[PDB]
Amino acid sequence: NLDQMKKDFIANVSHELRTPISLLQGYTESIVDGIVTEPDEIKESLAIVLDESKRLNRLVNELLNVARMDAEGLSVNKEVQPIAALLDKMKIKYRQQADDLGLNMTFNYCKKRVWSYDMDRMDQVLTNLIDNASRYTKPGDEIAITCDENESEDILYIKDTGQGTGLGLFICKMIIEEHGGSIDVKSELGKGTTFIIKLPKPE
Amino acid sequence: LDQMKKDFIANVSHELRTPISLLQGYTESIVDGIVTEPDEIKESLAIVLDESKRLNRLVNELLNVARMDAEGLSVNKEVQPIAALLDKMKIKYRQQADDLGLNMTFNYCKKRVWSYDMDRMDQVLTNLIDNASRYTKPGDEIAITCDENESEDILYIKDTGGLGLFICKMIIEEHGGSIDVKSELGKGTTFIIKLPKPE
Numbered sequence: 001n002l003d004q005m006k007k008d009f010i011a012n013v014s015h016e017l018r019t020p021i022s023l024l025q026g027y028t029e030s031i032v033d034g035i036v037t038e039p040d041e042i043k044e045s046l047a048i049v050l051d052e053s054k055r056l057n058r059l060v061n062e063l064l065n066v067a068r069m070d071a072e073g074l075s076v077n078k079e080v081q082p083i084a085a086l087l088d089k090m091k092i093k094y095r096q097q098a099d100d101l102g103l104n105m106t107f108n109y110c111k112k113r114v115w116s117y118d119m120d121r122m123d124q125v126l127t128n129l130i131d132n133a134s135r136y137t138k139p140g141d142e143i144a145i146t147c148d149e150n151e152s153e154d155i156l157y158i159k160d161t162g163q164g165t166g167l168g169l170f171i172c173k174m175i176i177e178e179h180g181g182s183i184d185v186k187s188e189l190g191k192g193t194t195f196i197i198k199l200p201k202p203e
Numbered sequence: 204l205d206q207m208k209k210d211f212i213a214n215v216s217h218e219l220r221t222p223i224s225l226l227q228g229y230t231e232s233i234v235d236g237i238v239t240e241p242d243e244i245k246e247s248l249a250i251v252l253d254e255s256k257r258l259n260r261l262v263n264e265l266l267n268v269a270r271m272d273a274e275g276l277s278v279n280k281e282v283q284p285i286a287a288l289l290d291k292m293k294i295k296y297r298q299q300a301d302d303l304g305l306n307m308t309f310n311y312c313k314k315r316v317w318s319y320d321m322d323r324m325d326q327v328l329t330n331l332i333d334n335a336s337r338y339t340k341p342g343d344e345i346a347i348t349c350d351e352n353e354s355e356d357i358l359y360i361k362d363t364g365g366l367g368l369f370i371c372k373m374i375i376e377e378h379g380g381s382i383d384v385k386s387e388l389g390k391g392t393t394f395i396i397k398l399p400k401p402e
Binding site: 017050071 | 205212216230234262270274
């Protein structure tokens, strides 16, 4: 039923991208065709144009990450390497967008831990999870990534204080399972959501 | 083919970035009070409008290709006229043919029943017309015409000018048909689709 998931994802994505385009087109045309005229209304219109343009950028980057994840398939080549190297990439990648969205992003208790993972594939996974949290969050919210371990497994928590579709998270689950690991989620309609990634310790 | 898809996404990433950067940058200069004089704002919003149209065209072309890949080789031909398909194309590209200054002509196609999967052929014709739209300029023409040989129905897509085309070929071959391409550098390209007659 992967095929149907892909169809429903594409259907949902089409709507989510067309809507912001139709909105910033209509507001722009409204100004250039002389329908909106009052300075306050021109300014409110342009603020929406800018907001929709930023939302489109975020939607497009999220979709392309899902596309790359899918195109790379199940190819996982784990290397023993610090987990902090991956989290530091996530930290620079989302530094500006966290500013923009008013989000506090934290990376906690991971210093000097050496894990076994595929950097490029886990980048794709963490991108999709952060992208997901960034959808459902508001200014003043937090996205906290925390490391832990049990006797056989390294553990990453991604927590936020926050058919259509699940594909992104379903591909994430496949990549993690190809690491020999697991992913679970807990969500409360209070508080927010936590993803739990477990990966086998380096042998 | 994994490198075809990887190369397509890389190309798509590059082409989407430009218009999105322009929309955001040229708008923000106005909201932040950097670009202020009426002449100036007019020229900036013309760019935003033009780039929003470009983005939309690109997004629709990409999602069509995604839908095509997602349905794989699923073809269920149904016996029905072709004019139903070409009517949807005419509607779907009416506004875009203005935006780009293109003349899209659809010759008369007698309403004999063809045999074809509407949604897969819609996808195919969308991709071929999208393709022609990116190799033309204002003034140019895209003309769709129907023909027949003894055992096949023939659609010609000719204009006066990767992965998408490859999947088009797969879909047409699953109809039991064939796709060919002809091009005289300068004059333009002709795609030739042959489908088995129903009867």
